[PDB]
Design a protein around this ligand. Structure first.
Ligand SMILES: O=c1ccn([C@@H]2O[C@H](COP(=O)(O)OP(=O)(O)O)[C@@H](O)[C@H]2O)c(=O)[nH]1
Ligand SMILES: O=c1ccn([C@@H]2O[C@H](COP(=O)(O)OP(=O)(O)O)[C@@H](O)[C@H]2O)c(=O)[nH]1
Ligand SMILES: Nc1nc2c(ncn2COCCO)c(=O)[nH]1
Ligand SMILES: Nc1nc2c(ncn2COCCO)c(=O)[nH]1
Lengths: 226, 230
């Protein structure tokens, strides 16, 4: 019954900003915040992130596993309780277990922070988790598209250190992974329904926090197409 | 309708012998062997288990979390497939599980945490991964437990007897630790778990010290005695 739409975007692209604004506009509009963000600054979540920063080749499996499990737990609790009640309920997933795997876990394998066996076991469990703990299927995706330069700027326009603004080439790689997944629909996934799911792309390069009506108009009619 | 019964015991107790004896006796009895015994000797599962088995023997404080999480998932999958994917049919259906999600957690994992092969974060993560899942999925709760009790010396003797290498045995001291953990769970019942039907689950304890390959009738009789009380 409850509508489910994940917000996607590269690091610091403006998802939390967008999702916090989106939730304020309707009592029908509810959100599930991303577990990774806020693990920075429960105890298990602080630890893995720091070690993962300190040494990605040791903790990427452990981290990627606990993050996807945290997201699933979170997304069930606001589904099996929160808002509805509501007349036309929509639940905005701040990121998803698809970008958990096909963006972040995948990048870590590709910079050799997980070896082949970590990454196959991860990819196996992923299926088994999504298949057992089913009704998480998205009806739409909203992609907040931005240039890697904008995100580089926005990481700086936030709070750098502790997190820091990493390489621009690291942002380009996640950019091209986001573009290849959401803009071009070429990434092949085990979850067949994804090819048959609507995507709203949003050029978020221009600043929006005090001027976002045009973005919400696009979101409201995208919602109407569902 | 299916009875779910675990076969537990120290390493080289003869769990795998015993379960392979019980499967030959009754049409209503079936076996779910150790996913982890098929990783000693083409299905990425075996490719992955094969690889995480050796890495673990080569570096336990690097690999304990990954091995333990993988073993438990594989066992959960094997229990789910055997169960609602078998013979029923059957008059008095019984499924023996060779070990359980519970030896995985309170024998092996806990032992690895006590030995610094997992840090606090890992052990805590493992535990809420195990807590969450065996409540979400797990049908696999048990109608009973059978306790095959041997001494660590019989166990080390039998480790030697089996095959060794990539499975191996070595320390008599380690077997002693595991042997002690099984008593607290299954014989004194002082080991309190995160599962409260388990403080109260019926437990059959079979002394398997003396070889039972050619003399198993009295043990099988007790099992039968035990099942028809469940
Ligand atoms: O239109 C925008 C969107 C974001 N930001 C800033 O960029 C930083 C990162 O944005 P956010 O946390 O929302 O990014 P996320 O990682 O959640 O996508 C924050 O300081 C925002 O204030 C901005 O100045 N204008
Ligand atoms: O009554 C017995 C039971 C066990 N074995 C041998 O003990 C070894 C270890 O047994 P198993 O692998 O079944 O022990 P498990 O790990 O399954 O408890 C094997 O080589 C068995 O053939 C034996 O000689 N006599
Ligand atoms: N959303 C998300 N972020 C991750 C993951 N792994 C590492 N990060 C880094 O998060 C900080 C930037 O979003 C993951 O699996 N999901
Ligand atoms: N059956 C089983 N064997 C394990 C496990 N972990 C390691 N091994 C292999 O045995 C050596 C440690 O006792 C486990 O969780 N289950």
């Amino acid at each position: 019954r409850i509508k489910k739409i994940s917000i996607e975007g590269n690091i610091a692209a403006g998802k939390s900003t967008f999702v916090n604004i989106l939730k304020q506009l309707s009592e029908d509009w509810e959100v599930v915040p991303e577990p990774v963000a806020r693990w920075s600054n429960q105890k298990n979540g602080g630890n893995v992130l720091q070690m993962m920063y300190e040494k990605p080749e040791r903790w990427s499996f452990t981290f990627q596993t606990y993050a996807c499990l945290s997201r699933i737990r979170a997304q069930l609790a606001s589904l099996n309780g929160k808002l509805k009640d509501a007349e036309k309920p929509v639940l905005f997933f701040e990121r998803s277990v698809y970008s958990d795997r096909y963006i972040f876990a995948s990048n870590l394998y590709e910079s050799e922070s997980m070896n082949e066996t970590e990454w196959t076991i991860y990819q196996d469990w992923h299926d088994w988790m999504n298949n057992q703990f089913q009704s998480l299927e998205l009806d739409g995706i909203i992609y907040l598209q931005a240039t890697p330069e904008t995100c580089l700027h926005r990481i700086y326009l936030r709070g750098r250190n502790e997190e820091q603004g990493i390489p621009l080439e690291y942002l380009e790689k996640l950019h091209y992974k986001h573009e290849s997944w959401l803009l071009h629909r070429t990434l092949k996934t085990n979850f067949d329904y994804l090819q048959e799911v609507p995507i709203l792309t949003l050029d978020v390069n221009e600043d929006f926090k005090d001027k976002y009506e045009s973005l919400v108009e696009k979101v409201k009619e995208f919602l109407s197409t569902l």
